Amino acid sequence: PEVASEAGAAVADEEEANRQVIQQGAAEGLRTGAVSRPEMAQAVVEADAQREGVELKPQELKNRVNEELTQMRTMDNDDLSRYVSYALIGTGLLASAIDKTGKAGDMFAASYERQLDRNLQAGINQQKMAAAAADRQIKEKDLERK
């Protein structure tokens, strides 16, 4: 019946929206320096521990914070925002013993490689050596004055 509609309302509405809000917030926090990398490393570690439902022992908690930090050092600010959003929002698996899992999974996929395809489309980079474009602009302005 309404399985697809309920799945969309419980997936598309309040899963990727908060994810993108978190992404932009983390990007701003990195940019202005208000919140530093170790804070997010610790937050990710606590989130993963809560996901596993195991109380974290303080000393190796510091150990996980450290290994997460050295893992994250090899990524830039925007990749860091992507990682943080995915980690703090990453959920799913299965609940109860009913349907609606397959539709949720397929739209998770749709959104996922939709994100990767915009990544490829935005990584095409800019062209031109930025000196011929000046010549073209000069030529158009010359046609305007003439």
Added chain:
Amino acid sequence: PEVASEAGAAVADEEEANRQVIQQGAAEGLRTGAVSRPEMAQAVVEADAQREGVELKPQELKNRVNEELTQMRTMDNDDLSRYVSYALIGTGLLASAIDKTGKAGDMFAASYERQLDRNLQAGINQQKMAAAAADRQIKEKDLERK
């Protein structure tokens, strides 16, 4: 019975009157710089999305604003006001299962070609090289003093 009167009262009265008010306001705001182009682009995108009745995902929403701005960059201020008025007021289609649709549609078309014919009649612009008119004025003034 009163089908034509109802159509006129529900079309000519408060459909293009408000549209015309928004056209004037948008022209004034663009002229004085109170409201910028991106605000109008965002408003148009939100209005279109509400018309389609689909909740807008923020990121490709930014993409819609971007491509809409690229679309608008090739239009002047008055054409922009026309576009915004039409987009923010553009409605119609059919409601219920009754008459009055045909008269509404034909007077939409009438007002539309009315707007285009004023555009053509205003586009005739001005003539003369603005030096013979001075000679004409001098001649009339000479006739007056004479």
Added chain:
Amino acid sequence: PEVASEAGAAVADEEEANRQVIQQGAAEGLRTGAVSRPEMAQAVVEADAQREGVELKPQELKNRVNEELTQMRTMDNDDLSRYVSYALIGTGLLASAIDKTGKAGDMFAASYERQLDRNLQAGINQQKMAAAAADRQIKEKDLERK
């Protein structure tokens, strides 16, 4: 019966008084610049539209204002006041299905003819070159001293 008395009372008195008061007010306002020409043009256009009982759309309302301004530009202040008074007070036609229209119309024509004939009698213009009159006054004063 008393139909002629009603014609005179409600058709010879209670608007030509207002007509001449409006004439005086418009003349004074134009003379002192308190009210400009576009204000009167707009008022005349609204009065005509209300007489026709049709709601007025904005840009062609401006179009009527402009063509009325072009019409007025070939008229002086006094003629403008006359025209404005006539337009603002001009009424008549027929009401109900009774008498009293014929005398109303004929005495309207009588008042109008009086207005034009007194206009001509005022426009007969002054004479004399204003140098012989000085000689006549000098001669009379000489006879007084003598």
Added chain:
Amino acid sequence: PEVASEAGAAVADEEEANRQVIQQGAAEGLRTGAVSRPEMAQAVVEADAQREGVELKPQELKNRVNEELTQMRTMDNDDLSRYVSYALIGTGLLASAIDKTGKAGDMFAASYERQLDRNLQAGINQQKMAAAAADRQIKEKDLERK
């Protein structure tokens, strides 16, 4: 019966008395310049119109004021006072279908020719060249000292 006494009390008492009070008041107003000629011209015009019981239409009301002014310009201040008093008090004609008319008429007459004969007796002016009278005064004073 008492028609003559009632006639005298209704004419000789409160007809000429007010007339002469207005005469002296108008003379004083002319002399001191407190009230000007056009005010009295307009007052006379309104009084005549009220006597005729016809409402005066404003424009030709100004016309009557003008013709009254150019009629009055050929009279001096005292003649102006006479004219104004007569115009503002001029009444009479007939009332009811009874007596008292003839006595009123004859005393109106008597007062009239009384005013004219006083005017003639006052218009005899003065005589003598005003140098012989000085000689007579000198002679009398000489007889006084002697």
Added chain:
Amino acid sequence: PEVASEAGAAVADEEEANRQVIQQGAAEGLRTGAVSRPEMAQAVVEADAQREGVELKPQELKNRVNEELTQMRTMDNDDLSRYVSYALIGTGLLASAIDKTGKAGDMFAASYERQLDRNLQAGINQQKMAAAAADRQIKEKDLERK
């Protein structure tokens, strides 16, 4: 019976006593200039009119005042006081249909010729050249010192 006593009490008591009081007052007023001649002329004219019991019209009243002033211009201050006293108190004639008129008339007469012969005895004038009196006084003083 008491006819003579009543006549005396109604004549000698409060008829000429008031007259003499007004004579004194008028003499003092003229002497000090507090009251001028035209005021008494107007008072005399009003008193005479009230005696005749006829309401006085304004301007002919002015000419009565005028000829009365011309009359008094031939009289000195004391004669003027006599005249004003007589005019303001002059009464008499007859009342009712009873006696006491003859006695009143005869004592009016007696007082009148009493005023006349008092006037003559005052007007007998002084004598002497005012130089022999000095010689007489010198002679008496010489007799005293001797």
Added chain:
Amino acid sequence: PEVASEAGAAVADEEEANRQVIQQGAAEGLRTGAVSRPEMAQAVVEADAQREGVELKPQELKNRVNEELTQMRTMDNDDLSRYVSYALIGTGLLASAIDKTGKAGDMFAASYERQLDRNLQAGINQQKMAAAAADRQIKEKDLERK
């Protein structure tokens, strides 16, 4: 019976005592100049008129005052006081139809001629040339020192 006692009481006691008191007061008034002669002339005239019981008319009242002043001018201050006292007090004649008039009158006489005889005895004045008295007093003083 007690007729003589009553005559002595009311014809001798408060009828010369007040006379002498008035005499002394008048003499003092003349000596200090507080009250003048015309005031007593007027007072005497009013007293005489009241004695005659006749109301006094103004100018002949002044006439009696003036003739009384002329009468007084030939009298000195002391004689003036005598005359004033007599005039202000002098009474008598007869009352009722009873006795007591005779000894009252002869006692008035006695007092009168006793005033005259003391006047003559006081009018003998003084003797001596006022130089022999000095010699006599010198002789007495010389006898004293011796």
Added chain:
Amino acid sequence: PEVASEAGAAVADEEEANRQVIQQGAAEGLRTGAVSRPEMAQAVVEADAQREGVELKPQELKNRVNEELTQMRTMDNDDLSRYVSYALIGTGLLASAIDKTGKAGDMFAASYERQLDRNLQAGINQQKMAAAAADRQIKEKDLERK
């Protein structure tokens, strides 16, 4: 019976004591000038008049005062005090139709002749030339020092 005791109580005491008090008071008044001679002359005159029980008329009252003054001028201050005391206290004569008369008279006598005999005894004055007494005093002082 007790007639001698009553005589002593009401006669021998109660005027001679007051007489002597009056004497000393009059002497002091003369000495200090507080009260003058004419005051006592007038007081004596009034006392004598009251003794005679006759009211005094003011003028001859002044006459008695004057004759008393010229009578008193020939007496010194102490004789004046004696005379004044006797005059203001002098009483006696007879009362009722009983005793108390004769012994009153004889003790008045005794007091009187006692006053005269002390006057004679005090009139012996002083003796000696007031130079031999100095010699006697010198001699006694010489016997004292010796």
Added chain:
Amino acid sequence: PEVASEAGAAVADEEEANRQVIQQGAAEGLRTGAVSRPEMAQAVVEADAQREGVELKPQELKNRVNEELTQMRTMDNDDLSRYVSYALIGTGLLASAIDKTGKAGDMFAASYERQLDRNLQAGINQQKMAAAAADRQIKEKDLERK
């Protein structure tokens, strides 16, 4: 019985004690001049008069005061105090018809003789020429130092 005791208590107790108190007071008053001789002369005269029970007429009261003063001028201050004390306290004679008179009289005599013989023992006078006593004192002092 107690006749002698009563006499002593009524004589020796409050007769001489007060007498000697007045003696001391009079001596002190004369010594300091607080009270003069004439005051005590007057007091003595008044006391004697009261003892005789006769009212004193003022003038011969002064006479007795003067003669008493002449009597006292021949006595010194202490004799004067004796005299005044005796005079102001001098009493005695007889009262009632009982005994106690003889004892009082004999003790009066005893006290009197005591006063005289004390006076003599005080008046035995001092001896020596007041130069041998100096030699005696010098001699005693000589044996004192030796």
Added chain:
Amino acid sequence: PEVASEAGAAVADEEEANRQVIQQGAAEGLRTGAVSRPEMAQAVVEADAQREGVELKPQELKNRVNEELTQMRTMDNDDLSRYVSYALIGTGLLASAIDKTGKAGDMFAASYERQLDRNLQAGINQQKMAAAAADRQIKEKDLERK
């Protein structure tokens, strides 16, 4: 029985104790001059008179005071205190017809010649010429230093 104890408590307790206190007070008063000799002379005289129970008359009171002063002048201050104490406290004699007599008397004696014998033992005076004692003291001091 207790008669000897009663005598001791009535004599030795409050007779010589107050006597010695009085002696000390008198000695101190004489030493400091607070109380002079005549005061105690008068006090002793009054005490003796009160003991004799006879009222004291002023003069011979002064005589006893003077003779007591003469008696005291031959006594020194200490002996004066002894005498004053003895006189002021000296009492005794006999009362009623019972015991308290012999023991009181002979203990009075015991105290009396006890006072005399201590007087003699104190009057043995001091010995030595006050120069050998200095030599003895010098010798003892020399023995101390040695």
Added chain:
Amino acid sequence: PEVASEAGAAVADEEEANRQVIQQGAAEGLRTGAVSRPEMAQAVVEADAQREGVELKPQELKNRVNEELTQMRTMDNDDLSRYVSYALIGTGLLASAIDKTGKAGDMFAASYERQLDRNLQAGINQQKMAAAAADRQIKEKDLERK
């Protein structure tokens, strides 16, 4: 049954959590000098005595404090914190007569060997002489500029 969950709760929850917290606190206190070594020596001695349940006498208490200080002097700060944490945390032995002892012991030993093996893995120390690393970094930056 649930002996394993109770084992984890009673071994890993609040047993080495407080141990590691105490480790951190002791390390910080030693680093900042807030708490000195003798304080922890005394605390350790008191904890051991309380574990043995024997009251400590003063001097040998000082003796244990001193020997514990000697024991600590051969240790650095970090291992001192380790020892202190073990001292006031180390507990165990057996309670009641039930299970849960074996799991407690074995996973106590598990955490223990974990602590030593991580100690050895952290004690592997750093390598390189710190001059070749600079060369490598220089080469990498050269490749970046190139």
Added chain:
Amino acid sequence: PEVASEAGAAVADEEEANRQVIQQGAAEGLRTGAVSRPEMAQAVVEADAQREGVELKPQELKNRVNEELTQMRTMDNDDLSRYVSYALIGTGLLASAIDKTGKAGDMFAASYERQLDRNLQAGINQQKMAAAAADRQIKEKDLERK
């Protein structure tokens, strides 16, 4: 029975203790001069008199004070304290007709003998000439430095 305890409590408890306290107080008073010798002489005399139960007459009271003073002059301050304490506390004799006197007296004697023997043991005085002891002390210090 408890006779020994009663004797000890009422003989040795509050009898020598207050005696020694009195000794200390007297010694301090002598040392600081707060209380002088004559005060204690008088106190001792009064205490002895009260012991004999006889009232002391003031003069020979001074005599006993003097003889006590000359007795005490032959003793030093500490012996004076001994004597004063013994005199002020010295009691004993016998009371009632019961036992407890004998051992009271013999241990009185024991305490007295203790006092005298400790005085002898304290009077053994110090030895050495106070120069050899300096040599011994120097030798000991020399042994110390060496």
Added chain:
Amino acid sequence: PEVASEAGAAVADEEEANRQVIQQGAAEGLRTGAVSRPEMAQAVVEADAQREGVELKPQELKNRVNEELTQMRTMDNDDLSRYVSYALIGTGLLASAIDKTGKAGDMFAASYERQLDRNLQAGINQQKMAAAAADRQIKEKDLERK
């Protein structure tokens, strides 16, 4: 039963603890000079007297303080603290007629020779001449820099 436990709780708990507290306090007081030696001597003497239950008479009390101080002069401060602690806490003997005495005695012993061998082990004294230790420290430091 609990005899040993009762003995230990009544001896080891509150006998040596208080004793050693007083030892520490006395050592501190002697070190800082707050409490002097005579105060401790007096306290010890009073405690001993109270233990003997005999009231100490003041003078021989001073004797005990004196020779007690002479005994104390041959001991140092720490030996003095030992002595005062033992004297002020020294108790024991036997109470009631029950057990627990032997165990108390043997633990008194145990504590006693525990104090003795602690004293010996503290008095084993230090070794070395304090110049070879400097060489040893220099050698170790040289090995460290090497």
